[PDB]
């Protein structure tokens, strides 16, 4: 069935989505979960939005990521205008035309993170670790808590994700490659990868590892 959360709206705007929900017997929750089917985003005239946690978890889940205009237009035309026509196309960081959520909604038999062990390491801001972890799981990766907990062998491909910012140490994130044998990278590798829903390649995101 239909269950929604909204992102980047004002109370008045939210009151409109609620009005929408009421009419169409659609559920409306504060927090995105397994069940959540729609993510309603604030966008500019052309369906570009800002990047928010729900934005990512939305794409990651292959949910409908639709512009707020889906709501107000349906209201205005006293009916529900199928989501296909209002889907969000891009964002203020990853380009106005990348068709992110689209590829996602479509590529659910091939998660950009098939055969990956990812370990979100150290502190993050504005995004709790377990949420980043949930994200990459939805993308098919498998989470690993400790650097030393990486599966050994060849089967899989390990990766260490850090967000340099939230650090206060000077022997911290430069020395990860000493405690394990995995590529290191910034969170950006994940978000940008999730935005485009195209498995970006570590090249541009690697961090300097002291041997």
């Amino acid at each position: 069935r239909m269950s929604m959360v909204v992102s980047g709206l004002t109370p008045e705007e939210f009151m409109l989505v609620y009005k929408f929900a009421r009419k169409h017997h659609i559920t409306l929750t504060n927090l995105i979960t397994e069940e959540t089917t729609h993510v309603v985003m604030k966008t500019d005239a052309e369906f570009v939005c800002e990047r928010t946690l729900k934005y990512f978890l939305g794409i990651a889940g292959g949910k409908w990521v639709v512009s707020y205009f889906w709501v107000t237009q349906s209201i205005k035309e006293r009916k529900m205008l199928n989501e296909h026509d209002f889907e969000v196309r891009g964002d203020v960081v990853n380009g106005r035309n990348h068709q992110g959520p689209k590829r996602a909604r479509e590529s659910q038999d091939r998660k950009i993170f098939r055969g990956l062990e990812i370990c979100c390491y150290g502190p993050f801001t504005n995004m709790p670790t377990d949420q980043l972890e949930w994200m990459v799981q939805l993308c098919g990766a498998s989470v690993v808590k400790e650097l030393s907990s990486f599966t050994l062998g060849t089967g899989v491909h390990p990766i260490v994700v850090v967000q340099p910012d939230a650090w206060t140490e000077d022997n911290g994130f430069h020395a990860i490659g000493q405690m394990c044998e995995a590529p290191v990278v910034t969170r950006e590798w994940v978000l940008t990868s999730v935005a485009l829903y195209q498995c970006q390649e570590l090249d541009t995101y690697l961090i300097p590892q002291i041997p």
């Binding site: 980047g8 800002e50 946690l53 960081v93």
Partner: peptide, 4 residues
């Protein structure tokens, strides 16, 4: 919400 926080943005990224």
């Amino acid at each position: 919400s926080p943005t990224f």
